[PDB]
CSV table of C-alpha atoms and ligand atoms in Angstrom, one decimal:
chain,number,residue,atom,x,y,z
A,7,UNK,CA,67.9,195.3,-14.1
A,8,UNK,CA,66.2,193.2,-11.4
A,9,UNK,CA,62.8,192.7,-10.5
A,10,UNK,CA,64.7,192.7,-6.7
A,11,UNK,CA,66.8,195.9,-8.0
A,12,UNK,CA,62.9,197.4,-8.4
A,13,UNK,CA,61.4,196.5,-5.2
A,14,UNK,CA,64.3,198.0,-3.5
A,15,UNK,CA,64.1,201.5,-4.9
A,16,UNK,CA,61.1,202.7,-3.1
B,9,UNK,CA,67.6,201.5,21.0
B,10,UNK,CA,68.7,199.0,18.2
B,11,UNK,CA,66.9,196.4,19.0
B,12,UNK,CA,63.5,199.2,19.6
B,13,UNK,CA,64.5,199.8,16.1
B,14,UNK,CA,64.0,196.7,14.4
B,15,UNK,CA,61.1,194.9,16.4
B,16,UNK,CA,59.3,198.8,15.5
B,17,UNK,CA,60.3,198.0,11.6
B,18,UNK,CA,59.2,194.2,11.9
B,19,UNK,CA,56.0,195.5,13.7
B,20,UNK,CA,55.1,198.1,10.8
B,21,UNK,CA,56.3,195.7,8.2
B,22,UNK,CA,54.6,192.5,8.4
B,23,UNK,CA,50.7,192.0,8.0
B,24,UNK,CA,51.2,188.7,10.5
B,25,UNK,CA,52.8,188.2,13.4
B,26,UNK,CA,53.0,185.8,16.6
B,27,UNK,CA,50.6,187.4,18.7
B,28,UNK,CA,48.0,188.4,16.0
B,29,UNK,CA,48.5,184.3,15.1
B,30,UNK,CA,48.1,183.2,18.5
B,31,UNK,CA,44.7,185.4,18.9
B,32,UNK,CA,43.0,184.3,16.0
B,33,UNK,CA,44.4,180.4,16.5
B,34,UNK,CA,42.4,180.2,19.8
B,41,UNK,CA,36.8,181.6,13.1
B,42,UNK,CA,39.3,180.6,10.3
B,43,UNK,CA,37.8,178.6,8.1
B,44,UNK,CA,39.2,175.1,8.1
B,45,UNK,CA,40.7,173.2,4.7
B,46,UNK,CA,40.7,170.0,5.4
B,47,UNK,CA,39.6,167.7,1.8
B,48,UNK,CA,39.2,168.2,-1.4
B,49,UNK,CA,35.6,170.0,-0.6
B,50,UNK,CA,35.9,172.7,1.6
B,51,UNK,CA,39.3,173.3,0.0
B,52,UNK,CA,37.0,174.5,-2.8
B,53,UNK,CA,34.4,176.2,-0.8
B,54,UNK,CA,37.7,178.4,0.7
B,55,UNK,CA,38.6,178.8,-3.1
B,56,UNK,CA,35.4,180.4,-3.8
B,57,UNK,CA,35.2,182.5,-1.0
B,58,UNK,CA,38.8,183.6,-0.8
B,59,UNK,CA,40.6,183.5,-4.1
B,60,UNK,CA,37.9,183.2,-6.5
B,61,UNK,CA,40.0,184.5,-9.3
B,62,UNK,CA,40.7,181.3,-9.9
B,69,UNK,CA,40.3,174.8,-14.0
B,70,UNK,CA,43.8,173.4,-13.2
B,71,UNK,CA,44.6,170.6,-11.1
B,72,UNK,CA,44.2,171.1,-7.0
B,73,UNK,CA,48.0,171.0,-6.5
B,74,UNK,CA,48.8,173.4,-9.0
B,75,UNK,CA,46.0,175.4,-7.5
B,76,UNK,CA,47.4,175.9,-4.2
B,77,UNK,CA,50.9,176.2,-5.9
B,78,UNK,CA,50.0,179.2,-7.4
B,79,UNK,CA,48.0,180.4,-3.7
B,80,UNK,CA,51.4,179.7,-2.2
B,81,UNK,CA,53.4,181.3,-4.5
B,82,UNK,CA,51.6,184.9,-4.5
B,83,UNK,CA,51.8,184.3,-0.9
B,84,UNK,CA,56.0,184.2,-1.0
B,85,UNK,CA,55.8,187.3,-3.7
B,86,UNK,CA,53.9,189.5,-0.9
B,87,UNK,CA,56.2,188.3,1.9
B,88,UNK,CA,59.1,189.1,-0.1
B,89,UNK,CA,57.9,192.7,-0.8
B,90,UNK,CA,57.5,193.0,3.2
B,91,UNK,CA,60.8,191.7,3.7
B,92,UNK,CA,62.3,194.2,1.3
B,93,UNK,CA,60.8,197.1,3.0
B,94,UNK,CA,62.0,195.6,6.7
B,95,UNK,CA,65.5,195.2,6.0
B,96,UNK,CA,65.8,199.1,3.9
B,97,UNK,CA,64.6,199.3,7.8
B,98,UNK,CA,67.5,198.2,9.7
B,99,UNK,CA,69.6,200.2,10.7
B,100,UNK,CA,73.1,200.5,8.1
B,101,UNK,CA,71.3,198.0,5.5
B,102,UNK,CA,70.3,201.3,3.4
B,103,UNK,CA,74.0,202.3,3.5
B,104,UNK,CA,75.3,198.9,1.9
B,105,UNK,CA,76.0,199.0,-1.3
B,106,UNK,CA,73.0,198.2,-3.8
B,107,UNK,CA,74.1,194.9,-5.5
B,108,UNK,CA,75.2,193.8,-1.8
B,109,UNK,CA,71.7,194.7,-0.5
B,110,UNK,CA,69.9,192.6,-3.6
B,111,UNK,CA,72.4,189.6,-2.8
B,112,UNK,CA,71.1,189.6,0.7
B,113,UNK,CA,67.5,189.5,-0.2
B,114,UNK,CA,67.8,186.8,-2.6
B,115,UNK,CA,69.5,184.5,0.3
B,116,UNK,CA,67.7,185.9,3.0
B,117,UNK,CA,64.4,185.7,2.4
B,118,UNK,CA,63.3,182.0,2.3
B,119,UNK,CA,65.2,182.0,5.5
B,120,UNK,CA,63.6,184.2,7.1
B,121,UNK,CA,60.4,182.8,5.6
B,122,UNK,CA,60.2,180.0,6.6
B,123,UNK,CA,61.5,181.1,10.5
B,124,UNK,CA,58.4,183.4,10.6
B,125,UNK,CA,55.8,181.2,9.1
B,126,UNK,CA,56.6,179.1,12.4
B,127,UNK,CA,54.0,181.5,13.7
B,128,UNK,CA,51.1,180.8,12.1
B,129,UNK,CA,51.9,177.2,12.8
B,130,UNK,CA,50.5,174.3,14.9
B,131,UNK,CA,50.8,170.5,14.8
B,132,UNK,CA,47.7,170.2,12.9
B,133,UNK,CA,48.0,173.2,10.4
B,134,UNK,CA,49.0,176.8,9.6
B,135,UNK,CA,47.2,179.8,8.6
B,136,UNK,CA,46.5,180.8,5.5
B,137,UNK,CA,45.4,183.7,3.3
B,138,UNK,CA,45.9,186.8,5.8
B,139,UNK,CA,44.6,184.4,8.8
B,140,UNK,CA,41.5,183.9,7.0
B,141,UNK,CA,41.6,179.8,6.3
B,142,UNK,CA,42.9,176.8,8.2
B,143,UNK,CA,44.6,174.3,6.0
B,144,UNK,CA,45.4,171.2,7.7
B,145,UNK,CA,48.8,169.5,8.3
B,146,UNK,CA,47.0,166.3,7.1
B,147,UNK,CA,45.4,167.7,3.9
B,148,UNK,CA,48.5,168.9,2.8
B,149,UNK,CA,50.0,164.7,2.8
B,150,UNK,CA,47.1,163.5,1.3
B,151,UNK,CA,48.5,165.4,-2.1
B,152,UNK,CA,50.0,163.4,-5.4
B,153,UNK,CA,53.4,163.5,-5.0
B,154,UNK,CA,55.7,165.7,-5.0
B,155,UNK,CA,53.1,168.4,-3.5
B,156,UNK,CA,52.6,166.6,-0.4
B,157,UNK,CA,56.7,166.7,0.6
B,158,UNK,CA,56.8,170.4,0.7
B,159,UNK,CA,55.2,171.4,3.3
B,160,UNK,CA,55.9,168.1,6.0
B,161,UNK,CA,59.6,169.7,6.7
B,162,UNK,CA,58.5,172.9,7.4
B,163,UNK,CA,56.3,171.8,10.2
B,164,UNK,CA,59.0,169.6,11.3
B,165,UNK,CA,61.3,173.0,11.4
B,166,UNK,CA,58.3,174.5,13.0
B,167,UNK,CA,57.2,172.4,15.8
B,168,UNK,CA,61.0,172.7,17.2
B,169,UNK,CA,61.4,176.1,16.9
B,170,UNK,CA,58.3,177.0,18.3
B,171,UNK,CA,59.3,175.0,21.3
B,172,UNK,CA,61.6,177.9,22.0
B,173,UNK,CA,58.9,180.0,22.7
B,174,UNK,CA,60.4,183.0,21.2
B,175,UNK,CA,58.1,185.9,20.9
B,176,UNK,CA,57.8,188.7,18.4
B,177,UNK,CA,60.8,190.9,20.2
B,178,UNK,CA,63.2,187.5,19.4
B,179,UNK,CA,61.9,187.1,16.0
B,180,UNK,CA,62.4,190.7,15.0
B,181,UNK,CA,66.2,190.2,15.6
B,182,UNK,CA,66.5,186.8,14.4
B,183,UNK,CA,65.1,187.7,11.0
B,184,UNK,CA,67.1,190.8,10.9
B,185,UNK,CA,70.4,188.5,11.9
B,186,UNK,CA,69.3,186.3,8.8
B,187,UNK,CA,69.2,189.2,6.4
B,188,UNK,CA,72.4,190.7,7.4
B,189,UNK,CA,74.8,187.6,6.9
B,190,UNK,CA,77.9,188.6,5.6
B,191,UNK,CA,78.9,185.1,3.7
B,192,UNK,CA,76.5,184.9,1.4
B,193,UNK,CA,78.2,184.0,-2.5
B,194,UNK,CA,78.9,187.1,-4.4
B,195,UNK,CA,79.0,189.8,-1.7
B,196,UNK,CA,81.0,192.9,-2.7
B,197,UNK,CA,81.8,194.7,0.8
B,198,UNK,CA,82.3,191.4,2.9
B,199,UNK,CA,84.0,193.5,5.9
B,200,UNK,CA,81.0,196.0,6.6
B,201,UNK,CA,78.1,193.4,6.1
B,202,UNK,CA,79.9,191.0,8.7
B,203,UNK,CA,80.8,194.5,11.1
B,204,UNK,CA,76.8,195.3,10.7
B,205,UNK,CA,75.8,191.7,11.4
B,206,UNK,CA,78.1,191.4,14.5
B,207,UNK,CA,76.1,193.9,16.0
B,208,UNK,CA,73.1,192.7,15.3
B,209,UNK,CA,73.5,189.5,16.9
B,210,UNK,CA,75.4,191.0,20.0
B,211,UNK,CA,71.7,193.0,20.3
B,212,UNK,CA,70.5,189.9,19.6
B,213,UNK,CA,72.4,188.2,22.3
B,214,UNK,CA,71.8,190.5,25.1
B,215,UNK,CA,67.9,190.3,24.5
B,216,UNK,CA,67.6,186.8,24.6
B,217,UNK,CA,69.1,186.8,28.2
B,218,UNK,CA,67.4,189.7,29.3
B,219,UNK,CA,64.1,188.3,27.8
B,220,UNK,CA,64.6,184.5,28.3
B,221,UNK,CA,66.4,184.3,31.7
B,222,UNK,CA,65.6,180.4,32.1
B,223,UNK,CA,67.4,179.4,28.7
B,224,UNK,CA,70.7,180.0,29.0
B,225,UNK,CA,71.7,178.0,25.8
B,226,UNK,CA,69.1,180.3,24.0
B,227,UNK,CA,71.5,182.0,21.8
B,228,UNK,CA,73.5,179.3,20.6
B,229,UNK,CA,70.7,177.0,19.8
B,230,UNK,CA,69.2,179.9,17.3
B,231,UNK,CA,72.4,180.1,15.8
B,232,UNK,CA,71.9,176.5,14.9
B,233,UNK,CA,68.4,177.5,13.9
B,234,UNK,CA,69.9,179.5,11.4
B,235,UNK,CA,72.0,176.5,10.0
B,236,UNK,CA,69.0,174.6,9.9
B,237,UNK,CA,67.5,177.1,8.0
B,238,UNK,CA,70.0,177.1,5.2
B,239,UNK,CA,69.6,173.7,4.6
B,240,UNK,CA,65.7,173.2,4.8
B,241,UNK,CA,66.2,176.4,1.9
B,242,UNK,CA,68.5,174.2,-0.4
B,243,UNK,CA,66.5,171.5,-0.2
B,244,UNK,CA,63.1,173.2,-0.8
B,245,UNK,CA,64.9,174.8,-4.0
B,246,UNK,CA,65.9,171.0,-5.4
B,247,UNK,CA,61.9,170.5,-4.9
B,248,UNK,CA,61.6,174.1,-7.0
B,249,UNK,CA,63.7,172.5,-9.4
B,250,UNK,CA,61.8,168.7,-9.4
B,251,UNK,CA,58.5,170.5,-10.4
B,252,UNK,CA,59.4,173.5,-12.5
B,253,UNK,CA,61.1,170.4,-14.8
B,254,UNK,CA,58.3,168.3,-14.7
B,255,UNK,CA,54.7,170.0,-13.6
B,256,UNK,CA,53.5,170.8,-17.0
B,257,UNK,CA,51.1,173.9,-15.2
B,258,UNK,CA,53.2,175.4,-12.8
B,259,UNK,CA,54.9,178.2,-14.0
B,260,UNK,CA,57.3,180.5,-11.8
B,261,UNK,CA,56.3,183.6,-10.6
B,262,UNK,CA,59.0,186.0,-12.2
B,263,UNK,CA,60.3,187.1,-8.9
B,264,UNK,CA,60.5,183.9,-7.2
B,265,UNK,CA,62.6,182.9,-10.3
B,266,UNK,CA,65.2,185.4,-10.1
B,267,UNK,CA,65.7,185.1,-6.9
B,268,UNK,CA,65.8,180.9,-6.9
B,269,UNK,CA,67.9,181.3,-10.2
B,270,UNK,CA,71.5,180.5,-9.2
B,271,UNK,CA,71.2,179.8,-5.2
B,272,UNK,CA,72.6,176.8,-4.3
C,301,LIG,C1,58.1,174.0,-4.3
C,301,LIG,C2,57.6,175.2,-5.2
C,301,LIG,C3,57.3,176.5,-4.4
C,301,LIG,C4,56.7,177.5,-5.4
C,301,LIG,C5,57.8,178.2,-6.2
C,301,LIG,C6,56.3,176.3,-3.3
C,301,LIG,N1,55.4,175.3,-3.3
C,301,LIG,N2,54.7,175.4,-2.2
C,301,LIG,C7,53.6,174.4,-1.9
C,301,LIG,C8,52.8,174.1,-3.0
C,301,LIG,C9,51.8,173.2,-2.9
C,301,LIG,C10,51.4,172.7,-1.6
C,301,LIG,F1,50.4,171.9,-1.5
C,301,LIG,C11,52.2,173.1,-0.5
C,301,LIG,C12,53.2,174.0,-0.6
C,301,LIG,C13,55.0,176.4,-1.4
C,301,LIG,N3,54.6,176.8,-0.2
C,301,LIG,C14,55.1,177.9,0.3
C,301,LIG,C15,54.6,178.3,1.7
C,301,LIG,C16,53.3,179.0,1.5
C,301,LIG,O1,52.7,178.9,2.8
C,301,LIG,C17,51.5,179.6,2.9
C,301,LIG,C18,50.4,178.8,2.3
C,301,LIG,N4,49.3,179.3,1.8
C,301,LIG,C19,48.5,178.4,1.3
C,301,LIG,C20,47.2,178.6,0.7
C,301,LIG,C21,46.4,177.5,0.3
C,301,LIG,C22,45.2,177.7,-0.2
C,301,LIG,C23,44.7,179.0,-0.4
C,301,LIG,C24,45.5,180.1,0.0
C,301,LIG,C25,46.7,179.9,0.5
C,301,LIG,O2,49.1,177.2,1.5
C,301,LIG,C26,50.3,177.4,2.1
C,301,LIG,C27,51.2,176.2,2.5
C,301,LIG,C28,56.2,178.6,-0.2
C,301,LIG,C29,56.7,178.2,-1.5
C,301,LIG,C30,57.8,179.0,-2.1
C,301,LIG,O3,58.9,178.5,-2.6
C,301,LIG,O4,57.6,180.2,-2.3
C,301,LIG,C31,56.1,177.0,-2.1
């Protein structure tokens, strides 16, 4: 994914 | 109860703020040369042989990754930003934050420096154009951002919304659900609106001259990521955090 994706899932 | 809302989240969220800069800007230890810049380097990052610039590069940048993680958590608290579809929430982040970056860092800010490391240090507006080239033209705009918008005298209440108004702009490239990010910004900045004349009675041209805050904030963004550009290309030490290359990767 994201490392954005991440930080936005808790 | 909206606006309550987001100056609560922006209160919870963010280790810095105006007031907590103000209090401690009136003892920081002060970077001012090439000396006590190493004395604060021992004392306050003494993790880390590499040139000064690249030095403070790397400071700066593990600065941007930690504000980004606060920013992230703010926005999944504003109101309707959780209900936005996932991609549409990452695109927002990835244009929003410098933005609102480098509106809040106006805080810590002062004609003759800014705070640094969790309002520990002092690093002086000076020091910072006494660097080689091209580290000494990154900072000089942001002040120049800085000293105007300061002049506004927004406090943390304004700033809350502002920064909330940033995140939730509904033309950023590559937005899936255009039509509710614009619906949720709308009422953001009519919350925003009615505070600024409730709270700043005297300026009645208040609102309109942050929405061209917002403009200049755009640009002072595209230009900072051209000097991203000059020095990932060229500085043979200063690698990119991984975040702050994803999100600098393909904006403007
Ligand atoms: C252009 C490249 C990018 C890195 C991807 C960059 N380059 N520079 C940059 C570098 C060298 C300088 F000389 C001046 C500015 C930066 N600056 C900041 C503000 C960070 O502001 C808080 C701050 N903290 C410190 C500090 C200093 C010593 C010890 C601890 C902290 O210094 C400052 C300005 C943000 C960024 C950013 O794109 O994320 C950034």
């Amino acid at each position: 994914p994201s490392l954005l994706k991440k930080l936005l899932l808790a | 109860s909206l606006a309550k809302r987001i100056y609560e989240a922006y209160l919870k969220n963010f280790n810095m703020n105006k007031v907590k800069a103000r209090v401690i800007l009136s003892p920081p230890f002060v970077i001012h040369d090439m000396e006590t810049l190493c004395m604060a380097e021992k004392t306050l990052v003494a993790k880390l042989n590499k040139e000064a610039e690249v030095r403070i590069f790397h400071c700066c940048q593990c600065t941007s990754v930690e504000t980004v993680t606060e920013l992230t958590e703010f926005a999944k608290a504003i109101p309707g930003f959780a209900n936005l579809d996932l991609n549409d929430q990452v695109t927002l982040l990835k244009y929003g934050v410098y933005e609102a970056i480098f509106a809040m860092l106006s805080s810590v800010m002062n004609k003759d420096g800014m705070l640094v490391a969790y309002g520990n240090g002092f690093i002086t507006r000076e020091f910072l154009k006494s660097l080689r080239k091209p580290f000494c033209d990154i900072m000089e705009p942001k002040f120049d951002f800085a000293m105007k918008f300061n002049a506004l005298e927004l406090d943390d209440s304004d700033i809350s919304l502002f920064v909330a108004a940033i995140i939730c702009c509904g033309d950023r490239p590559g937005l899936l659900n255009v039509g509710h990010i614009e619906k949720m910004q709308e009422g953001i900045v009519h919350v925003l609106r009615l505070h600024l004349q409730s709270n700043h009675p005297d300026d009645i041209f208040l609102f309109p001259k942050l929405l061209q805050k917002m403009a200049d904030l755009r640009q002072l963004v595209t230009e900072h990521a051209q000097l991203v550009q000059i020095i990932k290309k060229t500085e043979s030490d200063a690698a990119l955090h991984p975040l702050l290359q994803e999100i600098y990767r393909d904006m403007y």
